[PDB]
Amino acid sequence: FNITETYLRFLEEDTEMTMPIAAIEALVTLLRIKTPETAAEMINTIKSSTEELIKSIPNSVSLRAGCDIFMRFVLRNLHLYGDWENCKQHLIENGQLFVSRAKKSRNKIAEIGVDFIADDDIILVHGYSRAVFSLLNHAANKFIRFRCVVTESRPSKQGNQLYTLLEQKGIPVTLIVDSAVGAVIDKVDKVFVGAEGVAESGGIINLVGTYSVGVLAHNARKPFYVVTESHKFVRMFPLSSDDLPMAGPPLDFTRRTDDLEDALRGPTIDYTAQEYITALITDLGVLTPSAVSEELIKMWYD
């Protein structure tokens, strides 16, 4: 029936219905066809389909995290030794209810996380996430004053994409390069960052220059933010500053070339430590440091 093909069908779609929540919805559809009653026939084939999904992954982490939560919920269903049919019906229904929960959480956060942006504050935003931009839009809906500074992120020219999406709202902006980002931290009140993953330790899994932002802000004593939806938690512990799951290059040094083809290669995903984050915002209340780990301990029961 395929799961990778179902995820590939979301091209012109996206937004509101997030990338992990679309992968979880694809997991439920694959589950509900071939009988969820048998725990031997099904769970092994679910594990093989997740393994096939990881093998097809080029540069994504959150899909592996979203599978875990699904699994957990499935196992927790028949924890009460209930009817092997009513528990199954509740499991299949919690697929559309999972995607509906992405709406309710966004409704919660955009009313909680507007409080952090005070009267007339200049913001420097880096790493686009659906939660952080939803804060930015629903604060403009609240009729509050805020200035915005665009960071020139270089994965697939994300800065320009961010700049255009800010233009469609009615908030004054200008381009700032990630090289010169050090020269901005004095006229900026607060620095906001949207995450691709949050660590077991309390650190962050993010894009092509976020650790660099974290350190500079720690030097300038100016606050550093993480805002996300509560599903991007893996049991991952990057021990060092440059160690991450990759399908591509971990810093390659190429031979002598004249035609100029082999060059670009640099760490596209970078880690930052727990100390650099001043504040974290999710739908699971207002909490930052060890909170993430408590969540993970609460899930894994280990």
Partner: peptide, 16 residues
């Protein structure tokens, strides 16, 4: 034993 597949080989059990 709870669930047995008599086709290819898949067995489910219960301790409690």
């Amino acid at each position: 034993v709870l669930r047995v597949d008599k086709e290819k080989g898949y067995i489910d059990l219960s301790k409690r």
